[PDB]
Amino acid sequence: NEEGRLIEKLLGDYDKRIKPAKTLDHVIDVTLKLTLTNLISLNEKEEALTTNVWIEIQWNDYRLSWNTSEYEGIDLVRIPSELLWLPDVVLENNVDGQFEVAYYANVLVYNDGSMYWLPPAIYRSTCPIAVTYFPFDWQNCSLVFRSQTYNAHEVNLQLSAEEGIDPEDFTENGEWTIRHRPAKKNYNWQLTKDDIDFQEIIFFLIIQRKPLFYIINIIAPCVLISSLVVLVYFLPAQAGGQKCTLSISVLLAQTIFLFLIAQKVPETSLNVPLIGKYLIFVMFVSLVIVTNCVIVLNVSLRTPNTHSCVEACNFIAKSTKEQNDSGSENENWVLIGKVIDKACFWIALLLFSLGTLAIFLTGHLNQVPE
Amino acid sequence: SVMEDTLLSVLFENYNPKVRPSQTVGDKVTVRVGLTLTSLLILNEKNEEMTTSVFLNLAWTDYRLQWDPAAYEGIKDLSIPSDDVWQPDIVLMNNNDGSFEITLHVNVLVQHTGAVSWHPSAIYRSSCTIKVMYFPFDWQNCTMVFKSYTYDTSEVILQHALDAMINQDAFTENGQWSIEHKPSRKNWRSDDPSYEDVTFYLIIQRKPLFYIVYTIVPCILISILAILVFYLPPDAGEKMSLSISALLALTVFLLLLADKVPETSLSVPIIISYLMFIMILVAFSVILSVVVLNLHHRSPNTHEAVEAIKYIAEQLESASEFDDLKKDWQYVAMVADRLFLYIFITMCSIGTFSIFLDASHNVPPDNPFA
């Protein structure tokens, strides 16, 4: 059925780099869509990500509707990349890495001139996550992508649901979670003052994270730590005299442990994102732990020292007794522990407060954004 | 002139680029393979990874390129880019852990009656079994098998030069190791129809003596404080507490050592030998110091009328000094002496043992340099 002649006919006139534009004043009808399938790297501190995107590419060019020998033969054709108009895709705000396997792949030419193509792409991008995205309220990841080649007066992109999802194939091994994916089809006019709009593709992704594992590594140590210091605090009333320094050994040990923590998780936030709110409670609930802690030694620091021939000589010896007694008396008026005992209950309720202030508020920063 | 344009022409007229210098299925083209090593740059003795560099000298004959007056008799030797001969897309059965650099697509030396000389130096990512057995003094040997990765020995035969050539022929002077010999044996495993790979043996010897030196000092210097903590008891019995300080200190030190050892073998591990027994030597000082600590613990305490007053005085003092004299009877120093010399036996015995093993390890397992 002219099968040979037809193929040979169009290829004669067949034009490569020219768009299937009826004329030049109403552009062509280009369809696109993306199904996430892999969110490979979340480096939120630098606001960048890598995803395998199903670049659903679609458009029209009847420049090749065929006859009985090709259209009718099979309403389906798979013809090579380099052989029809191809959208060189990229995410305005995100794509920071040229697409990988997102091009040069078999496209699809039905019989009426319908064109369908969908290569998978692993590429880098840069979405929000700017001093926020670590809360409980989430920063919507907004990625708009379009051909970076021509502008909407010849090219026109389409899309679909802007309501329905990113969690469609959001990775289960992510240290986060997604709750909604909105997407709008739009024109080109940005803050930078560019005109002649080339339409693009907006990708909202408001997602959650924070599934803490470090939480109780932080929560039990601090309680053990708080108790340790409250040991420092109540243990003195229980502890012997050789305990003032006992308490000290703990301060040394207590903060050896402390800044070691200060070195451990600070590292944490640098390799991953960052945010100050949760940060504030820790270091300052931590600085208060330290504060009343050294306060304690300054407390176990405070007090002045706790930090006939027969009878003439019987007279004076009965004195060393009363004399030294006056001295041991010293000890008395000095170490009558009103401040210490009370210091236990001091930190105790202060403990309860620092704790309540913090976990109660952690209750809130999980409960407002809940 | 003598049919120059003619020859010249006909040759390029009839010559086939993509063809093999042989006629049908037979003895094939006997290609010569022989590499003069440059030097080696990195031995990942831990994963058995080998990045070296050498010359890929190949050479066989193209009786299809024998010239005539001007290019044959005119200039018996002329240079011409490869790209026109079957090239051993050589991979290494164990090694060839990565691509060729300066290996293919380079010019070659073509002789008059067809001889072909191609001498390219290259860096190649290989992997030989230096296994986790690249540290015993008896060390081990490896199998380096080179050969093509699409061709099967049917249309060419491979042949070698020396087998003793050695690998220290271009051994890296930068190597923390040393070498005894390089065997070269031609192979054709019958598990595949394709005659293939050649096994090259590395009877490697890697003796980098640098930190085990100050590692000895711990063992012995730690022993200093050790013998010291075992010596400090009848030296300064009051060592009682200070003693425990010593082991905290002694244990943290050895645990940090525990810290550097795993991360250091992390790139160059082999048999445990050294670690195997220093691990025991470890456990030894560890437990010896802890049971001496229990040696330390075992002590439940240590860890007329005128004259009547007198009499009451006579009894007061004497009565309790026996009581504290009892404490003497209880914490005498029999054990300390006996086990400080059991300390003598233990530490000098287990000491002269790994001393010995280590002794035996460097001299005894040294001659298998083959």
Partner: protein, 370 residues
């Protein structure tokens, strides 16, 4: 000779490489897959990435390659290079992290009839489940799907070839160990479209992890610490003289436990172990915590411990006696009767917790070992 040049040239001319051996509208191009992992180079359970050896056995028929005495008569079966062939865009579904390595420009074999095989020596980059359920003793089955990438069951179909183990060439250098692996076929039609979609090979990797070295180092400082805390119990009841002395240890040891935490979570971060593994350490380590704090607060729990001439003698003797009293008071503080209670109180606790820790340890080791 035998139509020599006419043979060869004709073949080149009317033959389009890119054409797919479509035969009427039916069976699709029947093409089968058959993967034989020769061996594996490296894996990262954490990042679920593997670099493996694969020889892909690809089969299909091109009735256009059948011959007569001038192609098959020449030499039965022969070697024709790929290029001219339509290469299925093979792709590991939820995997595919990397390009097939050494798939390109290789050769294939054509029979006197036509049948062709394409089996190029591959090694590539993979991506399979490991989830936080792979390092378990109870493993997880790495779900790996393979099949035709951009063509449908109407244009083409990828089918399986045979059963074979994954431990058939499983890496003996792996930090994991195999249970079994099976692979069965399937055809995926989607409720989406009423059409008949691609075919697929689904791999299932059932292997359990954890190399045993780890095992020994960690549980022994625990029985280690067990003895110091064991001493933490026996040291006090048999000698309360070095309570503070132990203050030291409590510092040196939880910090030892703290620093072991850096090491094994990075292990945790180095290798994905099912979190329920973590709780072992959780309560275990943390009881070292709750027990201490009580044991040592209790350790600490005690008020201060942690004629006329004749009358002279009685006012003086009376002085010695009520201080006599006093001495007994503070000792009436640190009794040795219940420190024995806490000794068996908790040692049974430890033999309970311990044997309870051994419980689930032993239990699913009653499942894993099977």
């Amino acid at each position: 000779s035998e139509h020599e040049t006419r043979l060869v040239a004709n073949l080149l001319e009317n033959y389009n490489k890119v054409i797919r051996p479509v035969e009427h509208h039916t069976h699709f191009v029947d093409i089968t897959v058959g993967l034989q992992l020769i061996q594996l180079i490296n894996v990262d359970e954490v990042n679920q990435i593997v670099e493996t050896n694969v020889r892909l056995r690809q089969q299909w028929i091109d009735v256009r390659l059948r011959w007569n005495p001038a192609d098959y008569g020449g030499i039965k079966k022969i070697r024709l290079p790929s290029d001219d062939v339509w290469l299925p865009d093979l792709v590991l579904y939820n995997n595919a992290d990397g390009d097939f390595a050494i798939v390109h420009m290789t050769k294939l074999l054509l029979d006197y009839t036509g049948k062709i095989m394409w089996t190029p020596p591959a090694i590539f980059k993979s991506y399979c489940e490991i989830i936080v359920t792979h390092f378990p003793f109870d493993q997880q089955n790495c779900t790996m799907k393979l099949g035709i990438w951009t063509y449908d069951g109407t244009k083409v179909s990828i089918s399986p070839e045979s059963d074979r183990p994954d431990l058939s060439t499983f890496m003996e250098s792996g930090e994991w160990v195999m249970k079994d692996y099976r692979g069965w076929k399937h055809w995926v039609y989607y409720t989406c479209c009423p059409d008949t979609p691609y075919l697929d090979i689904t791999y299932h990797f059932i292997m359990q992890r954890i190399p045993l070295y780890f095992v020994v180092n960690v549980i022994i400082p625990c029985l280690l610490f067990s003895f110091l805390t064991v001493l933490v119990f026996y040291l006090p009841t048999d000698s309360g003289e070095k309570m503070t002395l132990s203050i030291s240890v409590l510092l040196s040891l939880t910090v030892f436990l703290l620093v072991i935490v850096e090491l094994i979570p990075s292990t945790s971060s180095a290798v994905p172990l099912i979190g329920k593994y973590m709780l072992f350490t959780m309560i275990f380590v943390i009881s070292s915590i709750i027990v201490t704090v009580v044991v040592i607060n209790t350790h600490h729990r005690s008020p201060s411990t942690h004629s006329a001439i004749e009358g002279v003698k009685y006012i003086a003797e009376h002085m010695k006696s009520d201080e006599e009293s006093s001495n007994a008071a503070e000792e009436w503080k640190y009794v040795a009767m219940v420190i024995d209670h806490i000794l068996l109180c908790v040692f049974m606790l430890i033999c309970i917790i311990g044997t309870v820790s051994v419980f689930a340890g032993r239990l699913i080791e009653l499942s894993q070992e099977g």
